[PDB]
Ligand binder design. Structure first.
Ligand SMILES: *[C@@H]1O[C@H](CO)[C@@H](O)[C@H](O)[C@H]1NC(C)=O
Lengths: 39, 49
């Protein structure tokens, strides 16, 4: 859907919180707090 | 073996990377797409060909 600046990719999978694009979601999780992106 | 009922055609085939069955592949090949900008295509039209 584009590129994401300010979030890091994790190799995990969760019932996602904020939709982004083609199978990618984002959430505000603790793994210090940050924005992470995942499938 | 499901009692003699052959479900091998609607069930997925794991040879191809896209886990889709025979009938689903026929449905995807029959319905053509307009090839819109859901995949990025600015760099394709950057080059004048
Ligand atoms: C099910 O059908 C396919 C093609 O229609 C065939 O290749 C396959 O052998 C059949 N399954 C069985 C168990 O005969």
């Amino acid at each position: 859907a584009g590129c994401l600046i300010g979030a890091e990719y994790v190799n995990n999978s969760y019932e996602c919180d904020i939709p982004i694009g083609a199978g990618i979601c984002a959430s505000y999780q603790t793994q210090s707090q940050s924005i992470i992106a995942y499938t | 073996y499901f009692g003699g009922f052959n479900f091998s055609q609607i069930l997925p085939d794991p040879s191809k990377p896209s886990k889709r069955s025979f009938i689903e592949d026929l449905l995807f090949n029959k319905v053509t797409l307009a090839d819109a900008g859901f995949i990025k295509q600015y760099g394709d039209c950057l080059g004048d060909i």
